């Protein structure tokens, strides 16, 4: 979690962009469910799947780029449990920030727009999707960093 947070800090641009993407799509789902309460539910499901695929793509690329730092850590003696916790916590923190900002601003916009078009804002309608997309992305992040525990520490021995 040390290196994960430091990575977030040092590369704030890419992480802020992906957090904006995931928060925007979570806000999209928030408003879509708020207006829902067949076609609507299908759209919601496919957009959940879109968010999951975006997370998987970004995280596989990020891990593949982190390979040598992970190799150095393994060589020094970092455990599989440690590296996995670091990768998954990085992913979970970013996805939490995303879903939280998206859901908050979406609930605000729904309270502001409930007058022109029938809007139903509840607390489930905002939390269920928030934690839902969070767990979507976390399952996907596990899928992505599946081979963080795989890297050969002798990579560190090279040039």
């Amino acid at each position: 979690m040390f290196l994960g947070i430091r990575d977030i800090r040092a590369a704030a641009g890419r992480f802020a962009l992906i957090a904006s993407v995931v928060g925007l799509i979570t806000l999209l789902i928030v408003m879509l469910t708020g207006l829902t309460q067949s076609s609507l539910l299908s759209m919601q499901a496919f957009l959940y799947i879109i968010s999951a695929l975006v997370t998987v793509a970004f995280l596989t690329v990020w891990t593949l780029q982190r390979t040598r730092d992970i190799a150095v850590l393994a060589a020094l003696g970092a455990s599989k449990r440690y590296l996995l916790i670091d990768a998954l916590g990085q992913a979970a923190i970013i996805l939490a920030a995303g879903v939280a900002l998206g859901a908050g601003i979406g609930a605000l916009l729904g309270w502001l727009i409930a007058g022109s078009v029938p809007f139903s804002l509840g607390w489930v309608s905002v939390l269920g999707p928030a934690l839902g997309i969070w767990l979507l992305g976390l399952i996907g992040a596990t899928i992505a960093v599946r081979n963080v525990t795989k890297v050969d520490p002798q990579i560190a021995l090279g040039a």
């Binding site: 150095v72 020094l76 003696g77 455990s79 021995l157």
Partner: protein, 222 residues
């Protein structure tokens, strides 16, 4: 007054698949090292120096023979590294997002304990970077990077220190400074240091050598 060994490698061999055939990367190597010794592994390229170093560092298991770190019996290889070994890699292998001080502190972190900032700063001062604890990696010269690498290897108070040609990318003056620093902390901290080099301008800083030839090792005093 005969100390126990820190590291004992008895008739260790590394056999690799080389295409359809096999290559014997290391052939029945026997070395033994005690506290406060700098032993230099020397020999032409391709004679198994880095392989001897990688089995001495529990980065690879030998296919036959034994590598024993007295005081790590019962630990698997990763924990043996994490609890007893320091790695002065050939490349500085610093993590870009971390500050110089954080290069040291993270080895406290993965070791399970609350990072000790004062010890980190003391060790950066010790390798000649007093006060540069906050510098980012892009701000450190190759010499300074290597000095940070050494301080990181010291952070965990290891008993064994493995230096893999850590002056390969440095000029004569910096190479002399870095090997002097290695010998000085080897003596100060009573480390058993295995150092691979190809530059004879460095052998003077060794107490003894392991001559490598075709994966065969010979322990020499001269």
């Amino acid at each position: 007054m005969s100390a126990a060994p820190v590291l004992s490698i008895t008739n260790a061999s590394v056999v690799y698949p080389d295409g359809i055939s096999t290559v014997t990367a290391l052939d029945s190597a026997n070395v033994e090292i005690f506290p406060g010794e700098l032993v230099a592994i020397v020999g032409e390229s391709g004679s198994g120096k880095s392989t001897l170093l990688s089995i001495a560092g529990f980065l690879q298991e030998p296919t036959s023979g034994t590598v024993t770190l007295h005081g790590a019996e019962g630990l698997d290889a990763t924990s043996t590294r994490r609890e007893h070994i320091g790695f002065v890699f050939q490349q500085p292998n610093l993590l870009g997002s971390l500050t110089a001080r954080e290069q040291l502190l993270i080895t406290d972190h993965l070791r399970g304990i609350k990072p000790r900032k004062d010890r980190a700063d003391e060790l950066l001062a010790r390798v000649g970077l007093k006060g540069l604890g906050g510098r980012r990696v892009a701000q450190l010269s190759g010499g300074q990077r290597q000095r940070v690498n050494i301080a990181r290897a010291l952070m965990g108070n290891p008993q064994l220190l493995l230096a893999d040609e850590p002056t390969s990318a440095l000029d004569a003056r910096l190479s002399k400074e870095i090997v002097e620093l290695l010998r000085d902390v080897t003596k100060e901290f009573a480390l058993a240091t295995l150092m691979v080099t190809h530059d004879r301008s460095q052998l003077a800083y060794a107490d003894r050598f392991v001559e490598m030839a075709d994966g065969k090792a010979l322990q020499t005093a001269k």
